[PDB]
Chain length 121, copies 4
């Protein structure tokens, strides 16, 4: 799956490129998008008091993002256990991967079947 | 008064602070204000009690820059049964470099400011 | 002009609605969009060391925004002086105005003619 | 150590802190770290000198909540000619509730860590 976004002015810092923690905000956004596009609009899940909180995140940065860049994230599910799973996220600007990472997230309890079935595409 | 420092991450490409952060800081001053009055706002949120904004205004005189030390002076200025206004003045280097206010109400569903809070505002 | 956005999970706070300062982030985003759509992609302007910094902003909030809401901002130029101008911004969710405000911004020097001409539509 | 408090605005609808904020706080710890070593980072940014991130990792053990008092313990752990790694440990209530690191380089155009900084890291 793909998640498009534009760098906003507010996403930048005084060094003139993106303030790096924003890369995790875009991963989180991509995560919600992923679940949604795959049939589970997370807004509902959130209202049920139910989530997929992070337990581990990582990101490696190859080239800077700038104000106004159009970018997208290729997201996929890499490991998938009973109560947890990993999402890999790839930042592509203009055909090129400019950063990449993952989030190990868990359910809150095990992952629901409708969810498992969905992940096995 | 609520003290704070400008983080690198509060700046943007233009070399100066992104503006809403001023609203973030007023929100923080507001919470720090109620807490020092004796009403720890973490306690209220837990009890699903809040003081939602209805209106907010800020007037920027001079720029904040990365690493600036700043404090906000908060006073309360329009207390009514169901709403109140906080005035916030940003002080840098002993001078006012921005000033705004927040109009806020009390909610749980809006409701009257609690009596204990009312008396604390009225002193 | 119109600027669409979705409330992200990160835009919300523990009270379960939008953290209000984000409304000014969306106004700023709308401001850049406005200038762009009207012929001046701000990314270039920024690289010239040239801006339209805020001197005053205000917003009034009628109804809460929630996670996943689709929203847009109707933006317009209300006053327009030699070295400054005002942008009014209206937050519409589902036909309804849920908040409204403005930004008084200035040039940095007077507003450029290409810009003035643009504002007189 | 770098002290900080969880602001209301650092939380999200789930009642707990939005995760990247942990990266924001590490970024702040990093800057506070270099400054206390004698290299005020505001001075470096002004001179267009930086220490850009190349990689960052965080491992979340327990939740931070609104109003939590927290501090980060920063140590330096992989110093090379052109890069270094900072380890950051979040301490709440005397316990480690998250821990990560940042791999960073020195830039101006990447370049070698300055000699004065090198010696300060090597002590």
């Amino acid at each position: 799956k793909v998640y498009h976004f534009r760098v906003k002015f507010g996403d930048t810092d005084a060094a003139g490129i993106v303030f790096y923690p924003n890369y995790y905000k875009w991963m989180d956004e991509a995560c919600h998008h992923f679940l949604t596009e795959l049939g589970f609009p997370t807004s509902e899940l959130i209202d049920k008091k139910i989530g997929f909180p992070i337990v581990e995140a990582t990101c490696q940065f190859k080239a800077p993002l700038l104000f106004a860049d159009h970018v997208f994230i290729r997201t996929s599910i890499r490991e998938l256990k009973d109560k947890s799973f990993i999402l890999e996220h790839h930042f592509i600007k203009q055909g090129r991967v400019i950063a990449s990472g993952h989030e190990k997230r868990v359910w809150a309890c095990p992952i629901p079947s409708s969810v498992r079935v969905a992940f096995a595409n």
